[PDB]
From a paper:
Without the last 16 residues, the ISAV-NP ΔC16 mutant also formed dimers, similar to the full-length protein, and produced crystals that diffracted far better up to 2.7 Å resolution. The crystal structure of the ISAV-NP ΔC16 was determined by single-wavelength anomalous dispersion (SAD). The final model contains 495 amino acid residues in total, including residues 5–25, 27–38, 41–45, 61–75, 86–112, 133–182, 201–320, 325–497, 504–530, and 542–586. Each NP molecule can be divided into three domains: an N-terminal domain, a head domain, and a body domain. While the N-terminal domain is made up of a single polypeptide stretch containing the first 111 residues, the head and body domains are not colinear, with the head domain made from two excursions of the polypeptide chain (residues 272–380 and 494–558) out of the body domain. Structural comparison shows that the head and body domains of ISAV-NP closely resemble those of the influenza A virus NP, despite the lack of significant sequence similarity. Although there is only one NP in each crystallographic asymmetric unit, dimers are found around the crystallographic two-fold symmetry axes, which are presumably the same as those found in the solution. The tail loop of ISAV-NP (residues 504–530) folds into an extended β-hairpin that protrudes into a deep pocket in a neighboring subunit to mediate dimer formation. The ISAV-NP dimer interface is ∼3520 Å2 in size, of which a 1518 Å2 area is mediated by the tail loop alone. Analogous to the influenza A virus NP, there is a potential RNA-binding groove between the head and body domains of the ISAV-NP.
Residue numbers in the entry:
A (entry chain A), B (entry chain A): 5 to 25, 27 to 38, 41 to 45, 61 to 75, 86 to 112, 133 to 182, 201 to 320, 325 to 497, ...
C-alpha cells in the first residue's frame, strides 16, 4: 500500500489503492475494513460513513436497493363476473373497513385521506401478514406512530373473507389463506409499482449479467414471495429467466420446472420453441445466444401478465368509509371501476419541492396500471398532468423520510381515464423538429418504402409489425378517445 | 342511360350511371351537365347543389382545396445579428405600426387583440400587396367590414423599410421590393401553416401521383408565389419534385434548373447523387424508382428549410402598440424573442364547440414553428395544453364563416417554450400497454440486439440511426428541459 481513496469503478463505490515505486499500480481493495484512509455505497461503507465523519441520497437508494434485491432474491429462488375479480372485490370490501377501524386508533381522519398514508398502511399490512414504528404524514410534517403487528395480523386474519365466501371452481384446492394471498399479490403489485418508478431494477439485471434493456421484464420483482407463489404472472418473466441462468452455472429438475413455467407464459409459438430450446447441457455461448434471443422476443411479445386495476389505497378506504360498496365491482377487466372511485373520493397528498404534484400524479398513474414500464402516452392520458419523464423527477422515493416536510393539498382525479381492452391507416411516417433540419421517422415504414432460422423470422416479424403505428382508446365517462402508443416510456431519457 | 346517382369512387364525388339490360353496366359520367337525376365536391356540382336543392363541410374543405391547389400550382410552375434577421425585425417594426394605424379606421382595439383578426389582417395584406370584404370577429359574433386594398397597398409600400434601411452584403442586387418579399415569405410561412393543419395537402400529392406519406414534404405549398420566388426554401421540396415529374411527362432546360435547385437543397451526399441520378431520358419505372427513393430519403433527411419564429400576429401588433421595440430581436435563430412577446402580450381568441381553446393553442403552436409537420411532442411542449391529435380536432378551418359564433376569452401564453437549436444513452427500448399484453418497441434497437447500392446504404443508414432515441431541449426563462422526439406527429391518427 501507499495511497488510498474512494472511487466509482463501475456503478458502485470502491476503495482505490495506489502504490508508487516500476511506476504506479492500481488496486481496488475489497477488504472494506482501511476505510478511514480513503451509485452503490454498500453496507460496511454506509455504516462507517453514517457512524463517523448527494452522499445521503445515493445511500437511501442503496439500502432501498438492498431491500428490493433481497425480496427479488426470495422470488427467484421460489421459481422452482370472473371468480378472481369477485374474490378480489369481496376481499377488499371486507378487509379495507377493518383497516379503517384498526388505524382509527392510530391516525386521524384527515391523515388516512393522505396518499402516502394509504401506501404506508398496505406496506405495514403486508409486513404484519408475514410492534414496529410507522412514518406518517401529518400537517405537512412527518410523525412516527407505533403499530402492533400482532393486533394488525389478527385483525386481518379474522376480517378477511372465509373459504366459503369466495367463488372457487369445482374441486378447487384453494383455501382462505390461498385466496387471501392471491388478492395480496394483486394489490401489492399495484402499491409497489411506484417504487419501480424510482428504482426499476437496472442494477439487478446488470448484476445478474442481463442487458439493462431487459429491465422492463422485471415488473413486480419485489412483491412479497408468500403472495407471488400463488400468482406467478404478477411477477414479470425476468425472475424465472434469471433463476434459469443462475442454475445453469451453479439441479436439473428445477430447470425443467422453471422452463415449463416460462413455456406456459409464452404467447407466441416462436417464444415457446425458443424457451424449450434452452438446455442445461449447452455451451456458455449459444445458451446465452438463445437466452438473449428469448429475452429480446419478450420485449416484442410480453409474457402472460396478471394484475388488477385499483384506485389509490386512500381513495379506496375513503370510498368504502363513505358508505359505498365495491362488492359488485370488477377491477380485473379494466380500470372503469377504479376511475369511478377516483372521480368520487377526495384524495389528498403531501407535496414539496422534490415530490411535486406532477410526481405524485405519475405515482398514482403507475399504480393504476400496476407497472412502471407502461407507455408514457398511456400514463399521461390515464392521470392528466402527470410527469412523462423520469428524468424530470427530482425525488428519489415515495416514502417520507421523517425529516420530510410537505404541503398537503388536494389530489383531484376527475378527468382520470382507463385504457379500453382491445379485441393505423395513417400516411404520416415522419416528423421534423422546429427547424425542419432533423427528422424522426418510422423505421418499419421507411424499410417497406425502400436456431438461426428462428432469429431471421423474429427479426422479419418485428420489422413487419413496427411499420404500422399502434393506437389505443382511453375511456372517460364522457366517451372514448384514440391515442397512439409511441413507444416512448418513462426512463426514455437517461439518467 | 337508365339510372343515375351520386357516389364516391376514390376520394372524390362523381355521377354514377347504371344501365340494365347483358345485365347491369356501371359508368361514371364526367359530363357534369344530368346533375338533377343524380370528399371533393368539385365546382359545377357545388354550384348546382348550392343554387338549387356534412354537405356544407366537405364543400368548404373542397373550395379551400381549390385555392390551396391554385396557389401551389403557381409555385410548381415557378420552380423554373444575421442580415436576414435584422431585416425581418426592421420590416416588422416599421410595417406592423402602419397596420395598427390602418385598421384603427376599421376595427376596434379589442378586435385587433383577437387571434383570428391578426390572421385576417396578414391575409388581406398579402392580398393587397398582390375594396374587398373582410370577415371579422366582434363580440363572439362575426361582422363583415370593408377594406380598400389600394389604400392598404399604398400604406404598406410607403411604410415599409427602404433599400438603405436594410443590411445587405456588398454588391447585393437586393431591392426594397425584393427584401419586402423575403420578409413576407417568412411571415406568410408562419400565418399560413395553420391551414396545413386542416388541409396538409394529401389530396394534392395523391393527384400528382405521389404517395401520401410525402405530404410532409409539402410545407408552405400555398405561400404566395411573389414571395416564395425570393425564398424558395420556405416552400418545401415537394414543389420542385412535382415540377420535375410533371415536366418529365409533358423543356429539358427547366428540368436542369429545378434539378440544380433540388441538388442545392440536399444536406447529405447520398441525396445529391440521387438527385443528379434523375434524368429526363429514363424509363417511367427506374425514374420513379429513383424519384421515390429520393422522396423517401427526404423523409429521413429533410431538405434545406428556411423560416422564422414569430409570436401570433395580434400579439405582435399589441406588443408594438404597447410601446415595445422589436428592432433588436432575432426571430431567425430560435423562438426566444417570440416567446418573450408571447408571455408579455395579452392575446385573446374566439372559441366555440368545434374551434376549442386546445384547437386554438395547436394553431398557435404550429405557426410558431411554422410547420404543420412538426413533432407532436414539440408542439405540446411549445404551447402547453394544445391538442396533439388532428383526429380530436372537430373544426375544419381557422377562418370564421360569417354565420360563426364564438365566446371570446383569453389566450394566455405564459409557460410557452421554444426548442433549443442543437449543435440518448437510455436502456428502455420498449413499453407495454396497461394490460402488459402488447408491446411497442424501438425497431432499430431490437434489430441490433438480434442505383441499387444506394438503396442498400440508405436502408442500412436509416436503421442505424433509428436505433437511438432522439432527444431535444425545450427552453423556458426558468431554464432548459429535455424531451424525446417520439416520431408521432399531428396526423398520426387517420382520419
Amino acid at each position: 500500500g501507499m495511497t488510498y481513496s474512494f472511487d466509482v469503478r463501475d456503478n458502485t463505490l470502491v476503495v482505490r489503492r495506489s502504490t508508487a515505486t516500476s511506476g504506479i499500480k492500481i488496486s481496488y481493495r475489497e477488504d472494506r475494513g482501511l476505510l478511514q484512509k480513503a451509485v452503490y455505497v454498500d453496507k460496511k461503507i454506509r455504516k462507517f460513513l453514517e457512524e463517523e465523519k448527494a452522499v445521503a441520497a445515493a445511500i437511501e437508494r442503496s439500502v432501498e436497493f438492498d431491500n428490493f434485491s433481497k425480496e427479488a432474491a426470495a422470488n427467484i429462488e421460489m421459481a422452482g363476473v370472473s371468480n378472481m375479480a369477485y374474490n378480489l372485490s369481496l376481499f377488499i370490501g371486507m378487509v379495507f373497513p377493518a383497516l379503517t377501524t384498526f388505524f382509527s386508533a392510530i391516525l386521524s381522519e384527515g391523515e388516512m385521506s393522505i396518499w402516502q398514508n394509504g401506501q404506508a398502511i398496505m406496506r405495514i399490512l403486508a409486513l404484519a401478514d408475514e410492534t414496529k414504528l410507522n412514518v406518517v404524514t401529518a400537517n405537512g410534517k412527518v410523525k412516527q406512530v407505533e403499530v402492533n403487528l400482532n393486533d394488525l395480523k389478527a385483525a386481518f386474519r379474522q376480517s378477511r373473507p372465509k373459504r366459503s365466501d369466495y367463488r372457487k371452481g369445482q374441486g378447487s384446492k384453494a383455501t382462505e389463506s390461498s385466496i387471501s394471498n392471491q388478492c395480496m399479490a394483486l394489490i401489492m403489485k399495484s402499491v409497489l409499482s411506484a417504487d419501480q418508478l424510482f428504482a426499476p431494477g437496472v442494477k439487478m439485471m446488470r448484476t445478474n449479467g442481463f442487458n439493462a434493456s431487459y429491465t422492463t421484464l422485471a415488473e413486480g420483482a419485489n412483491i412479497p414471495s408468500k403472495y407471488l407463489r400463488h400468482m406467478r404472472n404478477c411477477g414479470g418473466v425476468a425472475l424465472d429467466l434469471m433463476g434459469m441462468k443462475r442454475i445453469k452455472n451453479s439441479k436439473s429438475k428445477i430447470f425443467s420446472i422453471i422452463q415449463k413455467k416460462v413455456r406456459g407464459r409464452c404467447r407466441t409459438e416462436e417464444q415457446r420453441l425458443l424457451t424449450s430450446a434452452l438446455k442445461i447441457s449447452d455451451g456458455e455461448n449459444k445458451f446465452q445466444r438463445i437466452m438473449d434471443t428469448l429475452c429480446t422476443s419478450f420485449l416484442i411479445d410480453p409474457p402472460r401478465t396478471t394484475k388488477c386495476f385499483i384506485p389509490p389505497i386512500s381513495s379506496l378506504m375513503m370510498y368504502i368509509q363513505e358508505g359505498n360498496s365495491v362488492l359488485a365491482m370488477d377491477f380485473m377487466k379494466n380500470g372503469e371501476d377504479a376511475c369511478k372511485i377516483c372521480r368520487e373520493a377526495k384524495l389528498k397528498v403531501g407535496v414539496n419541492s422534490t415530490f411535486t404534484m406532477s410526481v405524485a400524479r405519475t405515482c398514482v398513474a403507475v399504480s393504476m396500471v400496476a407497472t412502471a414500464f407502461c407507455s408514457a402516452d398511456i400514463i399521461e392520458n390515464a392521470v392528466p398532468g402527470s410527469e412523462r419523464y423520469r428524468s424530470n423527477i427530482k425525488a428519489n422515493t415515495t416514502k417520507p423520510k421523517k425529516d420530510s416536510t410537505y404541503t398537503i393539498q388536494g389530489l383531484r382525479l376527475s378527468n382520470v381515464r382507463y385504457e379500453a381492452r382491445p379485441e393505423d391507416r395513417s400516411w404520416q411516417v415522419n416528423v421534423t423538429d422546429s427547424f425542419g433540419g432533423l427528422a424522426v421517422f418510422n423505421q418499419g415504414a421507411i424499410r417497406e418504402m425502400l436456431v438461426r432460422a428462428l432469429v431471421k423470422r423474429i427479426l422479419k416479424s418485428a420489422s413487419e409489425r413496427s411499420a404500422r403505428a399502434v393506437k389505443t382508446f382511453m375511456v372517460g365517462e364522457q366517451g372514448k378517445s384514440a391515442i397512439v402508443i409511441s413507444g416512448v416510456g418513462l426512463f426514455s431519457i437517461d439518467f
